Design a binder for this molecule. Structure first.
Ligand SMILES: CCCCCCC/C=C/CCCCCC(=O)OC[C@@H](O)CO
Ligand SMILES: CCCCCCC/C=C\CCCCCC(=O)OC[C@H](O)CO
Ligand SMILES: CCCCCCC/C=C\CCCCCC(=O)OC[C@H](O)CO
Ligand SMILES: CCCCCCC/C=C\CCCCCC(=O)OC[C@H](O)CO
Ligand SMILES: CCCCCCC/C=C\CCCCCC(=O)OC[C@H](O)CO
Ligand SMILES: CCCCCCC/C=C\CCCCCC(=O)OC[C@H](O)CO
Ligand SMILES: CCCCCCC/C=C\CCCCCC(=O)OC[C@H](O)CO
Ligand SMILES: CCCCCCC/C=C\CCCCCC(=O)OC[C@H](O)CO
Ligand SMILES: CCCCCCC/C=C\CCCCCC(=O)OC[C@H](O)CO
Ligand SMILES: CCCCCCC/C=C\CCCCCC(=O)OC[C@H](O)CO
Ligand SMILES: CC(C)C[C@H](N)C(=O)O
Length: 448
């Protein structure tokens, strides 16, 4: 019978949908920092490169934090499938805003649209994949690996296409390609979804009961009021700069798990997530810095004179696709969950330790071979194969899905503070210090 790589034919619709969404996101991410660099150079954007780097991180942190609202709203209010649709619409509008002939004024608007939009699409498109299988179907694990393979496939071709278009035609044309990428995703999703997806997910699966509406409304109103109240207090005492707001968003992003863990002999299990969560946060911190710190390194310290330097952002998902057939075989030919989160952290630690070598050996005033980043990403992706749901083979909801991206949000929130420490003069110290600390903790948190 007809399948998509052994999976229900509905996976391909979700496959292509998320592939084109990740295309739009990572296509934009591949040049957004360089764009901010450009806006500063022209004197249009009045921030430092350190703040611009910090923005890239807190943006990423808010993107995956936003998913928690989206997962909840779909399950209880609007539905999984309309959430994906309207999520993509906002994403597309976000990229269109950047495509418009404006400068720094369009940044915030674009960022908010994509944050909100991705919050709706990302956890729900991931949830709809599990809806293709009944409960005890062995293929479910394989279906997600294919799905993540599509995530990285879009993450691979996006910098290559968008980055090249940027260096030939300009940023606005490049950002318009990202919008088009999402537009393609909507088309395939809308028409393909009607054919392959359950109509059951056009309505919420856990609809708010009558008595539940007001408590939720009070909870939300108090949260927004308090947030606004904090903003007001900040503006009065003078804490109203851009890094000030990043600090606030950082604390909020970090306080949410702290309060979530503090919420929850069964308690020894909960305490046993604490080091696993830390290992995850630190790993995705290092991993997400590829689009910031490594992107900075690529542009400043690497000879990329015969190709767009944004193409280095294709190295991350390339290795995931390369490692995929091996690990898929490796797990069938052959480690606990805490170990994989530790060894994965050690590999990420080694990816930074390696990057300290060229500056220590050759100095930082010159340029080095692309192979250093290639090797560095090879190491960090090697550990990602131990965390990310790929290389797998032969039930839940949207909110619990979001909880998974929550460790990446804390990592980037952590990055929003840490990436400001990276520059030309601290290169060797930054890499070696944070790489060594990550290996040590990787060795500490496995025995712990
Ligand atoms: C395509 C490589 C896949 C190998 C997977 C195993 C993990 C290997 C990591 C290699 C460490 C990177 C060393 C490369 C390096 O730093 O040399 C650069 C310099 O020699 C340029 O000529
Ligand atoms: C630039 C503004 C673009 C606005 C989008 C155009 C709106 C046209 C039709 C709205 C359809 C919304 C329902 C789609 C949906 O819920 O997804 C489920 C689909 O049936 C396929 O799964
Ligand atoms: C329903 C929305 C679907 C539209 C998909 C996104 C396409 C939007 C615009 C495509 C054309 C954009 C032209 C880019 C542009 O204005 O360049 C101006 C110069 O490059 C400025 O240096
Ligand atoms: C936890 C994040 C919440 C994000 C904001 C949610 C929007 C604020 C309040 C919910 C809007 C009202 C719900 C609409 C609704 O479906 O009520 C109908 C119920 O079925 C009544 O039985
Ligand atoms: C900015 C914070 C305040 C945001 C308030 C947004 C809340 C929006 C609507 C909440 C009002 C209650 C809606 C109830 C509702 O629509 O129920 C539908 C009925 O079931 C109709 O059959
Ligand atoms: C979800 C719980 C939130 C609890 C945190 C309470 C708010 C505490 C501090 C306000 C946010 C930080 C303001 C920005 C700041 O740190 O100073 C700004 C810079 O130092 C000035 O350039
Ligand atoms: C089947 C893999 C297809 C290959 C696609 C990978 C291309 C994506 C990004 C290119 C990153 C730049 C790598 C350049 C490189 O490794 O050359 C190093 C040479 O030693 C140059 O001195
Ligand atoms: C197994 C994968 C590769 C692991 C790399 C292990 C190398 C560990 C540390 C390399 C960085 C050593 C720092 C050298 C250093 O600090 O020099 C100081 C500067 O030259 C300025 O004085
Ligand atoms: C489970 C796979 C683990 C793979 C680790 C094996 C890699 C071990 C050490 C790589 C260290 C890279 C340093 C290379 C180096 O310093 O050469 C300098 C330049 O090549 C000069 O031409
Ligand atoms: C330029 C590529 C865009 C073309 C549309 C996407 C279709 C192309 C390739 C589909 C590749 C599917 C590979 C799935 C895969 O290998 O992972 C499954 C393994 O079992 C992982 O455990
Ligand atoms: C934090 C990671 C799990 C995110 C992944 N690279 C994705 O785009 O889905």
């Amino acid at each position: 019978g007809k399948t998509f790589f052994g999976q229900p034919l509905g996976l391909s619709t979700l496959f292509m949908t998320e592939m084109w969404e990740r295309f739009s996101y990572y296509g934009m991410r591949a040049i957004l920092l360089y764009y901010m660099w450009f806006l500063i150079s022209t004197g249009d954007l009045h921030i430092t490169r350190a703040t611009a780097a910090s923005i890239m991180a807190i943006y990423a942190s808010m993107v995956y934090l936003s998913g928690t609202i989206g997962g909840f709203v779909a399950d209880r209010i609007i539905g999984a499938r309309p959430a994906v649709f309207w999520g993509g619409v906002l994403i597309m509008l976000g990229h269109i805003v950047l495509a418009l002939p404006f400068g720094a004024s369009a940044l915030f608007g674009s960022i908010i649209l994509i944050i909100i939009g991705t919050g709706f699409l990302k956890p729900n498109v991931s949830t709809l994949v599990g809806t293709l299988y009944d409960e005890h179907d062995r293929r479910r694990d394989a279906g997600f690996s294919i799905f993540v393979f599509g995530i990285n496939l879009g993450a691979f071709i996006a910098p290559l296409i968008v980055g090249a278009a940027q260096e030939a035609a300009g940023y606005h044309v490049a950002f318009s390609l990202a919008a088009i990428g999402m537009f393609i995703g909507l088309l395939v999703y809308y028409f393909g979804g009607k054919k392959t997806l359950d109509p059951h997910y056009l309505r919420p699966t856990d609809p708010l009961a009558p008595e539940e509406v007001k408590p939720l409304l009070v909870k939300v109103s108090l949260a927004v009021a308090g947030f606004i109240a904090i903003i007001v207090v900040m503006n009065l005492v003078g804490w109203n700069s851009l890094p000030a707001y990043i600090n606030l968003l950082t604390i909020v992003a970090i306080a949410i798990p702290v309060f979530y863990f503090a919420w929850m002999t069964e308690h020894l299990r909960v305490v046993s997530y604490i080091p696993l969560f830390i290992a995850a946060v630190l790993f995705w911190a290092i991993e997400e810095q590829g689009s910031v710190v490594l992107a900075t390194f690529a542009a400043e310290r690497v000879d990329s004179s015969w190709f767009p330097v944004s193409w280095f952002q294709s190295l991350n998902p390339l290795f995931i696709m390369l490692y995929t057939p091996f690990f898929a075989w490796l797990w069938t030919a052959w480690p606990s969950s805490p170990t994989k989160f530790a060894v994965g952290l050690m590999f990420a630690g080694l990816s930074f330790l390696l990057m300290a070598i060229p500056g220590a050996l050759y100095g930082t005033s010159g340029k080095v071979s692309p192979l250093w980043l290639v090797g560095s990403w090879a190491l960090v992706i090697l550990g990602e194969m131990l965390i990310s749901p790929v290389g797998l083979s032969v039930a839940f909801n949207s909110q619990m899905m979001s909880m998974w991206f929550l460790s990446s949000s804390v990592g980037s929130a952590l990055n929003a503070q840490l990436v400001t420490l990276y520059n030309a003069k601290s290169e060797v110290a930054y890499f070696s210090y944070f790489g060594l600390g990550s290996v040590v903790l990787g060795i500490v948190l496995v025995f712990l």
